[PDB]
Amino acid sequence: RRWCFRVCYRGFCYRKCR
DSSP states (O other): OOSOOOEEOSSOEEOOOO
16 A cells, blocks of 8 residues: 555565555
């Protein structure tokens, strides 16, 4: 949420700052 989301889906975690 805002500035990078970061979210682990029990195997894959997101990570994009923008």
